[PDB]
Structure 1
Amino acid sequence: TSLVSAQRLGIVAVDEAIPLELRSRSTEEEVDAVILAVYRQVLGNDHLMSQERLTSAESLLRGREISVRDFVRAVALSEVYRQKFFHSNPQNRFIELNYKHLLGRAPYDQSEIAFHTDLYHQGGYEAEINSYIDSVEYTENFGDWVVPYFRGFATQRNQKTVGFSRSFQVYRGYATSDRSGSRSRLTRELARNTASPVYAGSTAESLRGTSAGSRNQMYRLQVIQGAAGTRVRRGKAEYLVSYDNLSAKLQQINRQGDTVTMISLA
């Protein structure tokens, strides 16, 4: 996005990122950069140990035996990708990680969760992974030679608006990674076809003045509430409380049976 929203949302680096294309007759440093970019983006910005590198796959990329898309497929199908994204993750978290790593976006619909779940159940992890890489979306966005990059913060054709908001649920910052078993943040949002407020970068913080407590810290409690007291006017509720009253807010939320969806520092 433009700078004025970019600094607020903490997505400046994504906006200024330039797609990396492996051209013909590329030098050694260009193949090195492509391999590094693929490892960074497909493995979700983990510190990749040299013992986890795909030496044969990157040799085939180096000798121009395979394309960038093929190397991306090899990294995605590799046991390293399985270990850190599949074997200890729920299926819905796993496929949103696949959407982030392979297509550079957040899931748009619950039907996309129904797809890749049935696809896994029929054809295994390999068929499920190949669905993303062989998709029309991957072809039109990246082709055979462009390293996949995150696209959820930019307006795409055939995109739902919610994706942009949901993008902030799968991209938590430039210095973040998809390393830690974890549950998807988008489960209820996808199932009920909703959107959640974006609290990313500096958007989550709120004014304090003298209303914050001793340590000048406010907390935002996003809860789902119903009538169990006073009249409830909305199903969604947001409470801004100081640290000193946080426990009290939690307990009164708890004794009314309201479910806490998110708690963040504001």
Structure 2
Amino acid sequence: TSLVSAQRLGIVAVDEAIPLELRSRSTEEEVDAVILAVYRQVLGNDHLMSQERLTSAESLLRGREISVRDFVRAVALSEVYRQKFFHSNPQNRFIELNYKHLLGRAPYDQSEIAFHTDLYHQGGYEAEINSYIDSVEYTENFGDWVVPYFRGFATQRNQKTVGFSRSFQVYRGYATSDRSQGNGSRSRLTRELARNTASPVYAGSTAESLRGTSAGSRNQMYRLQVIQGAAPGRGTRVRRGKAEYLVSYDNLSAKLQQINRQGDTVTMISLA
């Protein structure tokens, strides 16, 4: 995207990112840069120690025996990827992680998730990982020699418009990763991917709201995406099923009590 949009959305560095291509007869610096870019993007900007750095497939690239795609496949098929993204994660989260790392994309629809879940159940993790690298989208986007990169913030030929809004729910920032505490993360897309809708983006400076004199003692606002239903008491007429609440710190516990007493479910709470 352009400068004014990406400055608000915090995706400036993704837009000024050049796809690294390992040309033939490349210098050791170029092979090292390709290996580092693969470890940053395929392993999701994790702090990768040298004890799990996969020296064999690194030498196979240095050797030019495998292509960049092979290296990406080798990295995604390794136990570093299994420990970081597969074993402690649920299937929805793991499929989203595969899309973000291997294809540089958010998933578009629920039948893609169903296809990848069915392929996992029919052929194992290795088969599932291969699905992404040996896809038409990977070959077209990166092919054999280009390091994969995030393409969800740009206009793609076969892409869904909801993919751009879901890319912010998948890509949290430049100085972020896909590791959580205990290495078990829940998916942020299961509410919308199953229902074929979108959420507001609210990424970085987009999430902010005007405070004024309404912010309370702490000059900060809290942003609540809540799915609202009809109250059993029917005291107040509910006008929309999905509702936005901007509430202060001094009323945040009270507002959570209000939403919980109304039976409404909280889907998102952020700063504003």
Q: 2:199 aligns with which of 186, 196, 199?
A: 196
- Where structure 2 has 5 or more consecutive residues not aligned to the other structure, the ranges are none
d(CA) in 2 for partners of 1:153 and 1:66?
A: 30
d(CA) in 1 for partners of 2:154 and 2:204?
A: 17
Q: How big is the shift at 1:31?
A: 0.4
Output one character per residue of 1:45-70: Cα deviation in whole Å (capped at 9) or x when no partner: 00100001000000000010000000
d(CA) in 2 for partners of 1:66 and 1:167?
A: 30
Q: 1:250 aligns with which of 252, 256, 271?
A: 256
- What SS does structure 2 have at the residue aligned with 1:121? helix
Among the aligned pairs, what percent are the same residue?
Answer: 100
Q: Which residue is 1:185 aligned to?
A: 188
1:235 maps onto 2:238 in alignment? no
d(CA) in 1 for partners of 2:205 and 2:130?
A: 37
- What SS does structure 2 have at the residue aligned with 1:117? helix
d(CA) in 2 for partners of 1:9 and 1:85?
A: 26
Q: How big is the shift at 1:201?
A: 1.4
Q: How big is the shift at 1:129?
A: 0.3
- What SS does structure 2 have at the residue aligned with 1:232? coil
- What SS does structure 2 have at the residue aligned with 1:130? helix
d(CA) in 1 for partners of 2:194 and 2:175?
A: 29
Q: How big is the shift at 1:216?
A: 0.8
Aligned-CA RMSD value:
0.4
Output one character per residue of 1:221-253: Cα deviation in whole Å (capped at 9) or x when no partner: 110001111100000000000000000000010
d(CA) in 1 for partners of 2:32 and 2:241?
A: 52
Output one character per residue of 1:55-104: Cα deviation in whole Å (capped at 9) or x when no partner: 00000000100000000000000000000100000001000000000000
d(CA) in 1 for partners of 2:46 and 2:185?
A: 15
- What SS does structure 2 have at the residue aligned with 1:203? helix
- What SS does structure 2 have at the residue aligned with 1:125? helix
d(CA) in 1 for partners of 2:215 and 2:142?
A: 48
Output one character per residue of 1:27-56: Cα deviation in whole Å (capped at 9) or x when no partner: 001100000000000000001000010000
Q: How big is the shift at 1:112?
A: 0.5
Residues 205-244 of structure 1: pairs in structure 2 closer than 5 A = 205-228=208-231, 229-244=235-250
Output one character per residue of 1:99-157: Cα deviation in whole Å (capped at 9) or x when no partner: 00000000000001101100000000000000000000000000100000000000000
d(CA) in 2 for partners of 1:213 and 1:52?
A: 49
Q: How big is the shift at 1:4?
A: 0.4
- What SS does structure 2 have at the residue aligned with 1:211? coil
Output one character per residue of 1:185-232: Cα deviation in whole Å (capped at 9) or x when no partner: 000100000000001010000001001100111001110001111100
d(CA) in 2 for partners of 1:215 and 1:20?
A: 46
d(CA) in 1 for partners of 2:62 and 2:204?
A: 38
Please, what TM-score do these two structures have when normalized by structure 2?
A: 0.97
- What SS does structure 1 have at the residue aligned with 2:240? coil
Q: How big is the shift at 1:8?
A: 0.2
- What SS does structure 1 have at the residue aligned with 2:51? helix
Output one character per residue of 1:147-195: Cα deviation in whole Å (capped at 9) or x when no partner: 0000000000011000000000000000000001011000010000000
Q: Which residue is 1:84 aligned to?
A: 84
- Where structure 1 has 5 or more consecutive residues not aligned to the other structure, the ranges are none
Q: How big is the shift at 1:255?
A: 0.4
Residues 125-204 of structure 1: pairs in structure 2 closer than 5 A = 125-180=125-180, 181-204=184-207
- What SS does structure 1 have at the residue aligned with 2:222? strand
Structure 1 residue runs of 4 or more that deviate by more than 4 Å after TM superposition: none
Q: Which residue is 1:26 aligned to?
A: 26
